């Protein structure tokens, strides 16, 4: 999988404007194949058009939590859903807590074309 495609598969959900129910994370973590060989412990889905997320690579340049300087913060807030494993959860019965919010996203960009390859954080 290319870096751009992996980002898309793990973080884009443009078909809904916001986390539906408390079971959104259980459904999405499984359908995007993030529960396949293990339970991905934390994952954030973004509910905006791909174009709008790709446009962040030309917005505010900031440092990544890792120290690199190819991170960018979205000027505006975006609809996101944080998916986190609950203290109970254990493979292969992955269980997730769903938290819907509107925050600025931070992503790492790379390549040509220059697009998002990593979800750094939200604020
Ligand atoms: C959620 C997501 O953004 N997936 C892409 C795969 N994970 C990933 C890609 C690139 C970097 C990276 C880092 S790093 O610290 O910059 O090296 C850490 C965890 C996951 C990724
Ligand atoms: Cl690609
Ligand atoms: Cl897949
Ligand atoms: Cl994430």
Describe this structure in words.
It is found in: Secreted. Belongs to the pancreatic ribonuclease family. Endonuclease that catalyzes the cleavage of RNA on the 3' side of pyrimidine nucleotides. Acts on single-stranded and double-stranded RNA. This protein is an alpha+beta fold and 123 residues long. The protein has one domain (1-123): Ribonuclease A-like domain (P-30 Protein, Roll). The chain is built from three helices and seven strands. It has helices spanning 3-11, 24-31, 50-54; strands at residues 42-46, 60-62, 71-73, 78-85, 96-103, 105-110, 115-122. Strand 6 and strand 7 form a beta hairpin. It is globular, with a radius of gyration of 14 Å. The structure holds 5-(1-sulfonaphthyl)-acetylamino-ethylamine (AEN) and chloride ion (3 copies). The site of one chloride ion has 3 residues, from helix 1.
């Amino acid at each position: 999988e290319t870096a751009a495609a992996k980002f898309e598969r793990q973080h884009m959900d443009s078909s809904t404007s916001a986390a539906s129910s408390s079971n959104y994370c259980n459904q999405m973590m499984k359908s995007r194949n993030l529960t396949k060989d293990r339970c991905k412990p934390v994952n954030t889905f973004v509910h905006e058009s791909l174009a709008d997320v790709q446009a962040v690579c030309s917005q505010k340049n900031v440092a990544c939590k890792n120290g690199q300087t190819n991170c960018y913060q979205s000027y505006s807030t975006m609809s996101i859903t944080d998916c986190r494993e609950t203290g109970s959860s254990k493979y292969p019965n992955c269980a997730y807590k769903t938290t819907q919010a509107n925050k600025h996203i931070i992503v790492a960009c790379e390549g040509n074309p220059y697009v998002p390859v990593h979800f750094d954080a939200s604020v």
